[PDB]
């Protein structure tokens, strides 16, 4: 597993149940873009669909997810979350 820093979703991604993280991160987790990933925060795990990072977000150590997803997980922007592939 790996940990990444929660950040806000881009507006058009809100409500799609996706997370964006970079390709190095996906490679470390052994996941492919378009797969479900399991994320853990303070409550129950959640599965979210992992999608590509935008160029400007590469290397930032972040995972973008929307507010509904952060609330279900029990996390806020800036928190580490654990991802499993």
């Amino acid at each position: 597993p790996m940990k990444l820093r929660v950040m806000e979703a881009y507006p058009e991604d809100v409500g799609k149940g996706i997370v964006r993280m970079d390709k190095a991160s996906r490679e470390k987790l052994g996941v492919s873009a378009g797969d479900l990933v399991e994320i853990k925060g303070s409550k129950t795990p959640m599965k979210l669909r992992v999608m590509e990072a935008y160029p400007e977000d590469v290397g930032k150590g972040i995972v973008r997810m929307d507010k509904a997803s952060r609330e279900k997980l029990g996390v806020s922007a800036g928190d580490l979350v654990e991802i499993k592939g």
Side-chain angles (χ1 to χ4, degrees):
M2 81 172 300
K3 296 204 98 99
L4 288 168
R5 299 287 285 286
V6 173
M7 295 290 284
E8 185 63 87
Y10 289 106
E12 75 172 33
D13 290 324
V14 174
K16 297 187 180 228
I18 69 161
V19 290
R20 292 189 181 279
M21 68 180 67
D22 68 18
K23 187 166 170 65
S25 298
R26 296 193 304 275
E27 278 289 281
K28 187 147 144 196
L29 293 158
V31 295
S32 290
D35 277 337
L36 282 172
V37 300
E38 189 183 42
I39 302 188
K40 294 279 209 22
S42 58
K43 307 205 259 137
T44 184
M46 181 170 203
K47 296 201 176 183
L48 297 150
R49 278 268 172 199
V50 65
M51 303 296 174
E52 289 88 346
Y54 285 92
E56 52 259 59
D57 291 325
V58 174
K60 285 177 173 173
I62 66 171
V63 55
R64 292 195 177 280
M65 67 179 70
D66 64 23
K67 186 165 54 200
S69 290
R70 296 191 303 272
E71 284 177 351
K72 278 177 166 184
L73 285 164
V75 299
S76 310
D79 288 348
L80 283 169
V81 286
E82 189 206 58
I83 306 114
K84 286 311 312 203

